[PDB]
Amino acid sequence: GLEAVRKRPGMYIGSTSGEGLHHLVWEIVDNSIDEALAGFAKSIQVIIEPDDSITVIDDGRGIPVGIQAKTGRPAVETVFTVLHGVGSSVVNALSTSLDVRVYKDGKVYYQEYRRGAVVDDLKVIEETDRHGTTVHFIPDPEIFTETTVYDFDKLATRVRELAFLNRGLHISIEDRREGQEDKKEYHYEGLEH
Ligand SMILES: CCc1[nH]c2nc(Sc3cnc4ncc(=O)[nH]c4c3)nc(N3CC[C@@H](N)C3)c2c1Cl
């Protein structure tokens, strides 16, 4: 399964250099873009956390949490744990840790993984009035041996491109790292312009 991804990451993300490190971001963001395309997500936030980890927040419907008959597991768990807009499990495999929060039907559903392996069963941890999905991941330095340090300008450039290609979407990029905090927000207007 996902162990194959950890041993041959080059076959799944193209490179284990800085390029592959940034590719992880797009693999998660692309899923949020698909939910904007479906018509539900209106805003996406990408955050470089102070420790070079990544958070992606959207306000879509939230990844399905119901048990699938085919697997006997919550759909969201399968998304991150089974190899398949299909790259979530690859990001999981290549991260020291990944946590997902799904905001759906008044509840926050939470699951975490470590180097691709499930920590515990999906659990309701809070009540909420919002909807969407938040994915946070820490890229694995065992995989990304050259660099685990993000390039804000590189991310911002593509985020702007994504805003343009998905006209109407609100998408932002934020750097929370020490001595260089920054945020850029992008939104190209539709017919209301
Ligand atoms: C924060 C990243 C994020 N946000 C999401 N929102 C959603 S919202 C959503 C809600 N209900 C759905 N029902 C059917 C469907 O096909 N797609 C859906 C998508 N789904 C995510 N998935 C599901 C499948 C895979 N593309 C990942 C994600 C992911 Cl991953």
Q: Containing H/E element for 25? A: helix 18-37
Q: How buried is residue 21: exposed, middle or buried, by Cβ count under 10 Å (0-12/13-18/19+)?
A: buried
d(CA 107, CA 39): 22
**Cβ of 58 less than 6 Å from ligand 1:** yes
The residue nearest atom 20 of ligand 1, judged by CA position, is 63
Joined together, the tokens standing for residue 128 give: 């909420």
Give the homologous superfamily in CATH for domain 1-193: Histidine kinase-like ATPase, C-terminal domain (3.30.565.10)
Q: Which residues 6+ apart lie within 8 Å of 37 measured at CB?
A: 166
SS3 134: strand
Our answer on whether the CB atom of 55 is closer than 6 Å to any ligand 1 atom is: no
The reply to whether ligand 1 has any atom less than 6 angstroms from the CB of 155 is no
**Which residue in 73, 77, 125, 80 sits closest to 104, CA to CA?**
125
Q: Give the pair of three-digit tokens for residue 6.
A: 């950890």
Q: Which residues contact 98 (CB under 8 A, 6 or more apart)?
A: 80, 91, 92, 112, 113, 135, 136, 137, 138
Q: Which atom of ligand 1 is nearest to the CA of 85?
A: 26
Resolution in A: 1.7
Q: How many residues would you count in the chain?
A: 193
Q: What are phi and psi of 28, to 5 degrees?
A: -80, -50
Q: Experimental method used, please?
A: X-ray
Residue 33 near residue 44, CB atoms below 8 Å: yes
Backbone angles phi, psi at 183, to 5 degrees: -150, 135
Binding site membership of 162 for ligand 1 (Cβ less than 6 Å): no
